[PDB]
Amino acid sequence: GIPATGDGACLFNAVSIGLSVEILSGRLDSQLDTPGYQALLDEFAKHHPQFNPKSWKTLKEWLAYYNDTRDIELILAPVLFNLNQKYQDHLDEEILNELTNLVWKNKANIENGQAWFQLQNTGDLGEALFPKLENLDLKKDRAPLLDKLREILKDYKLELTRENVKQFLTEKAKELLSALKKKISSDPHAFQRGYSCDELKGMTDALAISLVENREEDITDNRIKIRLENQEEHWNVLCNEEDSERFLDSTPSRLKMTSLEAYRGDKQVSAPT
Prior knowledge:
By secondary structure, the protein is of the alpha+beta class.
C-alpha cells in the first residue's frame, strides 16, 4: 500500500492517488464524458487558473506531468473535495434538523442570553442534537449564531413544538441556513475533520467508482474499485506493481505547498512545460 499524506483531507489524498491511476491507465475512459467526470473537469478548471484548454486531454497531461504521488495529492485532492460538495444532497436537511433541535430545546435559553456551554446539546437517548454546529468556531461562528437566532426568534409566533420550529426556520432562516452549509462543508475544520468512505458516496457513485476499505469489497459491484487501507486516521491506497511503475512517480516531485495551502488555492500551479 501507498501511504497518503495525513495533512489536510487524508482520505481525499488517498482517493486522489487511486483515481489518478485509474484515469491515466485508461480504465475510466468510457466514463470521461459522463456528468460526474464533466463536473470533475469543471472543478479542476475552477481550482487551477493555468489549466487550459478545459478538456480531459489537458487534465491527463497535468496528472502525467505532476506524476509524483505528493504532487497528485496537491493538484487533485482539493478538486475532489470541492466536487464532493456538489453531491451533498442530504446536507441541507441535516443542518435544518440540527438548527431545529438547537432552537426547539433552547429557545428561552437563547432569548435570555445564555452561552453555548449552557445549552442542551443531547437528546433523550443521549444522542448529539447538533454536532456539526457545535464543531464550528466558538467565537467566530457560534457566538454570532446565537446573536442571529435571538434576532430571528423575535418573530416566532407559535406554540413551541419541534414541527413548528422546523417550519419556522425553513421560512425565516433560509440565508442563515445557506451560510451554515458553506461553513460546515468547506471551512478549514471541515477540510481537516476526517471523512469516511460513505461521506463520499454520492461523488464516487457519480464517478462510477466503489471505494473498497480494508478488503471490504462487494463482489456483485463491477465498477472500478479504488482500494484503501484505513489506519485509525491514516490512509493507504493499494496499487499493484505494474500500475505503480507505469502511472505513478514517473516524474520528480515539483510542488512545495502544504495541503491546506493547496486547498486555499491562492498559489497557482504552473501549466506543464
